[PDB]
Design a protein around this nucleic acid. Structure first.
Lengths: 266, 286, 65, 169, 129, 188
RNA sequence: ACGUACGACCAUACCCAGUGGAAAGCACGGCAUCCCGUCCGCUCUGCCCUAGUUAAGCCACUGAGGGCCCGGUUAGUAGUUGGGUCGGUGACGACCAGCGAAUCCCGGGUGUUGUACGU
RNA sequence: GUCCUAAGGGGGGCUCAUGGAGAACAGAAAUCUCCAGUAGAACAAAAGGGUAAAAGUCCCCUUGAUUUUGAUUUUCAGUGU
């Protein structure tokens, strides 16, 4: 990288101890329905700040070959991906792809129910501000599987999607919206995605009384094909790096409230 | 060879609609709304300042996913309620409109049952925080003495915390890095206009009459402008929501719907379009 | 004295902390009551030694402002 | 609708061009002629590419020009037409409605001979416009001029004949 | 309830020397008076952060500015051994300067408004003499 | 109205992610009415939002600053995959291995500064780069030249380019060593 | 419904041309003292909102030629994996499955929409 | 063999290659004007979707050539501020 700007871009794409917030690439196949496009638009609107959008048709079938997906991940530095497609067998499909080191870590299909889908514009409410992260509620007994399955995978993927940016502090005025994902264990269980705006009322106590109002979109999914990670790749992915600001604990050595280093004798 | 061919039309990528209309700088908008020093998930406000030929438009705006929201708006044609009837686009009117917007924002917030989480979790050592907003000038040039900073000065004096420096106010001296508050006071109270009125009345009486025909007709002398604008500032601070009715024709919303539908031209139906196509085919055959 | 920053004759003299004429030292300026533009208290600054301490028996310095 | 006062033709600008092809004293003298004729400081133009046949190199000042608007453009165009005896050719007028010509000696415009400067020829180019030209020039909401508001070659020829009482052959 | 001030409202220059006294008007915060070592006092409009009047006439540092309790007068005391009274709504000196102090006049105190008698106000000046 | 939700199983939380996990089953009614279905779903959302807001307001430290009323959040605890592997130390270059074997200490930042004091001019000057001391004399008016060196000099060349020649030679050798180190590290 | 200011989708919105536009609003417009910027008050900036004018911008409608966007069809077909399961020594030929196109063709369309202030 | 107040950073303004039509010398190729121009230029990389009121290009400001602090990370320290 001769150019300083290209050097900055390379350093941004370099692996780090404290990683950047993940970027999501939104793209569609050669055949994609308008319902699937509207679903993709709603998800992009919820995740605008850390997303990139493709606009062409891509002749990609992810469960056959994902070389093009890896190429797009490497080129755009996107580690989350939402891929839309349609078929006779699968009329409205959203394929969530999560990458690790520009290679496919895992994949999951979501089949969208067309008759119960409502977009964000179908609810006449105030909407979430751009860049604001919502809170998350995961409800039901389908997420407590002792063995890893499609529903635990979907919980992990949706947390990664709606995660936003990590922060040690938050304003109390930034707690006005919640994404609720409901799914129960069992013919196929339905995973329901809802978004609600939050109102607070006086209750005569210190704690306020919460009320909810529907924000959109209204989403119903059936979980389909699932590509699970290689165990070694998963181990490398769930390895946790330690920040230099996390000190290594030494035996009989501590720091007092004045910052003096204090030793213990016995 | 033809540059504009079928391949060119198929390969063409359109810009954003407001970029095509030349109204929005999306490069600046992205940094105005999606960039933050802190990540406390807090809402952000911008003071949008726009100028037309005859009016000044000031808005307090949040940015939501399906479109922007307006928290408050003040227009310079509303200054007729406070006594300013001339020069509704000048620097003094810009200051007064910014002051009006600031007072309306504070009166709407009550800084002049449902309750917020801030009041729910307020501590013992908690003080009132000022309303904060950032300036959005759009495509206007940000040079020294521009009226956008007059709107900004009016709003900041009205009580909105707007982060700013002073090197673009009228009277700023660039070599000495100092601001002439006498020139700033003159521009706030419209003394540049009054000095122009005196200068034109001394030099070119005909051009004076043509340029200030409405001032003379309404008997607004140059020496009374400072008092007029000061009294307008006092009235704005006293009653920020004074109602002003214009001389335009007044109907109800349904009456305006009917009046506009009387002049709307309806889109042709498929049957009429096919009839016209058949008539054209018959005319071509004949 | 907080530290010896730069003895002009030799980096070894700096490392040994020799206080001679022209040496840059870091001093504690809490008593002077210096506040920065952000409201923080500045308690460490740089001074230059203006005398010969080996001849005088004292260290004299001027704050670099 | 052609009798609307907002469709009235007028001169937008007049550009005076001297392409000496060589940098230095000759270009400085040509800039002196342009400054003395216009009343304002001229513009030095640099060569885009290197041509060994013309003896020029890239980024080298080889030309000078002045843009003049207002009644000053009208009076300078009047002097140029006095030099050309109010005679123009049909090929001079462009398809977009502008026109121009050239003179070989600037002395015939009314400039006294100074031996330290010399004789320079000049290119006159006049652009024509209608009111409402700001639509394509302003920064905000810049748009295209509509087709019926554009100026044609026949219209500017007719305007030239009616205004300056010249002839076009 | 008075809320704590947290930020700069205005920074207004105009004085050529350090400010030695400051006081708001008793009527409201819109009018502020300062007295400086450039031998002048100044009235400021605090709503727009602009200068309003410049009271000149002292030949020493204005050590004190003091509003009358009703707000209709401004008294200045200076190192030139004198006291002056000004009309704050027009910036003009009222009558003549008060003469009789041998040395610098350091402090002023108006008589309280409910104690004024004989159709006048009374002003006390403390001096170095 | 109550501000407490009572359920057979307690909620779990990750306040770093603003996440509430409800382990209780969502008994969705087996009806065909969208109104009652979304009413039950909104009730579940209401309970989850209520307990999340209660946990945030009661179990986190609250600080009132000029920015606003802020809650201190714990670091996130839900395990999520990284996008890229954890950075690792680079393979040792030939110089680094040689310095480790020979006990050669890294130079200090003051020792490696691009500044030196020229006695003869009494000025401070750069050692390298633009107008550095390594190019000293290339623009001086007069240069004494050796007769033997001028005789051995190639035709057309000048003594004014000798220092740039030595600089180009040194740079070429350094980049060759750097490319060899890069190739070996890529092989490893 | 129409207009304006910020917008969201970002061609159904783009490229070319014609016709019409009440009210208000936009706009063209007029003037260069002051602030400010140019070779040129062209642009930018300041002052007027009076006067002219819907000519253009803008809006609506229409029109070709492209382009673009939906839905069906292609078609569960080519193709690709499976002795998969039956024969065939085997390779392979059917059958069974799992994934799964595109061309052609047909039909429809040429902008919807949020907040605020107004007509 | 020649030249440079260095590169870099921030902000602001502007739009390119090319084609058509015009302008004394000027003629395929000098400069100037208008129209059209999805980038077909330039700069980076090696897109299967890099960048157009910019990441291009010119102005303004900085050019201070490798800051300070750390009980923290890793390595080292017979010269452990």
């Amino acid at each position: 990288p001769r150019n300083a700007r290209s050097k900055r871009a390379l350093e941004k794409r370099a692996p780090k101890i404290v990683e950047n917030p993940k970027t999501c690439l939104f793209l569609r196949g050669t055949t994609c329905s308008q319902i699937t496009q509207d679903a993709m638009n709603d998800l992009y609107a919820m995740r605008q700040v850390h997303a990139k959008r493709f606009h062409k048709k891509n002749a990609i079938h992810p469960f056959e070959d994902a070389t093009s997906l890896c190429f797009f991940s490497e080129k755009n530095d996107c580690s989350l991906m939402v891929f839309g497609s349609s078929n006779k067998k699968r009329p409205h499909t959203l394929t969530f792809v999560r990458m690790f080191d520009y290679k496919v870590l895992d994949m999951l299909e979501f089949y969208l129910d067309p008759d119960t889908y409502r977009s964000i514009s179908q609810f006449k409410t105030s909407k979430i501000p751009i860049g604001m992260r919502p809170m998350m509620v995961f409800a039901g007994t389908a997420f407590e599987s002792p063995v890893p399955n499609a529903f635990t995978m979907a919980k992990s993927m949706l947390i990664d999607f709606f995660r936003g940016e990590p922060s040690d502090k938050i304003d109390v005025e930034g707690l006005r919206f919640v994404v609720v994902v409901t799914a129960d264990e069992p013919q196929k269980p339905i995973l329901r995605l809802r978004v609600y705006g939050i109102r607070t009322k006086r209750s005569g106590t210190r704690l306020p009384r919460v009320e909810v109002e529907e924000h959109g979109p209204r989403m119903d999914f059936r979980l389909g094909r699932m590509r699970e990670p290689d165990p070694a790749m998963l181990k490398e992915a769930m390895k946790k790096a330690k920040t230099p600001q996390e000190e290594r604990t030494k035996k009989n050595i501590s720091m007092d409230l004045l910052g003096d280093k204090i030793g213990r004798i016995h | 060879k033809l540059v504009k061919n079928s391949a060119y039309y198929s390969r063409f990528q359109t810009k954003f609609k407001r970029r095509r209309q030349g109204k929005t700088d999306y490069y600046a908008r992205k940094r105005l709304i999606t960039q933050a020093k802190n990540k406390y998930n807090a809402p952000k406000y911008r003071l949008v300042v726009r100028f037309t030929n005859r009016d000044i438009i000031t808005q307090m705006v949040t940015s939501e996913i399906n479109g922007d929201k307006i928290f408050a708006a003040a227009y310079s044609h509303e200054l007729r309620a406070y006594g300013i009837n001339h020069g509704l686009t000048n620097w003094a009117a810009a200051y007064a409109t910014g002051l009006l917007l600031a007072r309306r924002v504070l009166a709407k917030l009550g800084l002049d049952g449902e309750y917020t989480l801030t009041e729910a979790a307020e501590t013992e050592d908690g003080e009132r925080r000022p309303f904060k907003a950032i300036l959005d000038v759009g495509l206007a040039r940000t040079s020294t003495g521009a009226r956008v900073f007059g709107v900004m000065k009016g709003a900041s004096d009205g009580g909105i915390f707007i982060p700013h420096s002073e090197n673009r106010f009228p009277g700023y001296d660039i070599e000495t890095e100092e601001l002439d508050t006498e020139v700033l006071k003159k521009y706030i109270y419209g003394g540049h206009v009054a000095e122009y009125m005196e200068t034109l009345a001394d030099d070119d009486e005909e051009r004076y009459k043509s340029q200030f025909v409405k001032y003379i007709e309404d008997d607004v002398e140059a020496d009374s402008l400072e008092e007029l604008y000061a009294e307008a500032h006092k009235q704005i601070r006293a009653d920020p929501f004074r109602k002003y009715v214009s001389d335009a024709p007044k109907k109800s919303k349904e009456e305006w719907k009917a009046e506009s539908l009387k002049y709307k031209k309806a889109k042709l139906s498929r049957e009429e379009r096919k009839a016209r196509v058949e008539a054209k085919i018959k005319q071509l055959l004949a | 004295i907080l530290s010896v920053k730069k003895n002009p004759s030799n980096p070894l003299y700096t490392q040994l902390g020799v206080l001679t004429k022209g040496t840059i030292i870091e001093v504690n300026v809490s008593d002077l009551g210096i506040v920065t533009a952000s409201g923080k208290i500045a308690w460490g600054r740089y001074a230059q030694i203006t005398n010969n301490p080996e001849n005088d028996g004292c260290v004299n310095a001027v704050l670099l402002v | 609708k052609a009798q609307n006062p907002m469709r009235e033709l007028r001169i937008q600008k007049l550009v005076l061009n001297i392409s000496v092809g060589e940098s230095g004293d000759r270009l400085t003298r040509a800039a002196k002629v342009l400054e003395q004729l216009s009343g304002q400081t001229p513009v030095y133009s640099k060569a885009r590419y290197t041509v060994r046949q013309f003896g020029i190199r890239r980024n080298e000042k080889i030309a000078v020009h002045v843009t003049v608007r207002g009644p000053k453009a009208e009076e300078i165009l009047e002097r140029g037409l006095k030099v050309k005896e109010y005679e123009l050719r049909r090929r001079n007028f462009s398809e977009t409605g502008n026109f121009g010509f050239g003179i070989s000696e600037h002395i015939d415009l009314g400039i006294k001979y100074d031996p330290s400067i010399g004789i320079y020829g000049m290119d006159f180019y006049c652009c024509m416009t209608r009111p409402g030209e700001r639509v394509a020039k302003r920064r905000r909401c810049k748009s295209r001029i509509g087709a019926s508001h554009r100026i044609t070659r026949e219209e500017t020829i007719r305007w030239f004949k009616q205004r300056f009482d010249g002839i076009v052959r | 309830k008075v809320h704590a001030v947290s930020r700069l409202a205005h920074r207004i220059p105009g004085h050529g020397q350090p400010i030695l006294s400051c006081q708001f008007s008793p009527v409201s915060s819109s009018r502020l008076a300062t007295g400086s070592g450039d031998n002048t006092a100044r009235i400021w409009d605090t709503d727009s952060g602009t200068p309003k009047f410049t009271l000149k006439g002292h030949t020493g540092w204005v050590l004190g500015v003091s509003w009358s309790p009703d707000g209709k007068y401004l008294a200045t005391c200076s190192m030139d051994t004198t006291v002056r009274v000004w009309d704050p709504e027009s910036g003009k000196q009222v009558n003549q300067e008060f003469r009789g102090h041998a040395k610098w006049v350091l402090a002023l105190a108006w008589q309280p408004y409910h104690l004024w008698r004989d159709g006048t106000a009374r002003l006390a000046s403390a001096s170095k003499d | 109205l109550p501000v407490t939700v009572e359920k057979p199983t307690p909620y779990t939380f990750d306040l770093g992610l603003l996440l509430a996990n409800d382990p209780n089953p969502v008994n969705v009614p087996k009806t065909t009415d969208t109104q009652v279905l979304e009413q039950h779903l909104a009730s579940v959302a209401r309970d989850g939002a209520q307990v999340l807001i209660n946990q945030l307001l009661t179990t986190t430290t609250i600080t009132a600053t000029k920015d606003g009323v802020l809650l201190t959040l714990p670091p996130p605890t839900t395990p999520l995959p990284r996008e890229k592997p954890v950075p690792q130390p680079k393979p040792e270059t030939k110089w680094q291995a040689f310095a480790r074997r020979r006990g050669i200490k890294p130079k200090t930042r003051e020792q490696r500064r691009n500044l030196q004091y020229n006695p003869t001019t009494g000025q401070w000057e750069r050692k390298w780069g633009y107008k550095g001391a390594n190019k000293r004399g290339e623009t001086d008016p007069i240069i004494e030249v050796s007769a033997a060196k001028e005789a051995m000099r190639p035709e057309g060349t000048s003594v004014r380019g000798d220092k740039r020649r030595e600089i180009r030679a040194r740079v070429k050798k350094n980049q060759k060593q750097m490319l060899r180190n890069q190739r070996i590290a890529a092989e490893k």
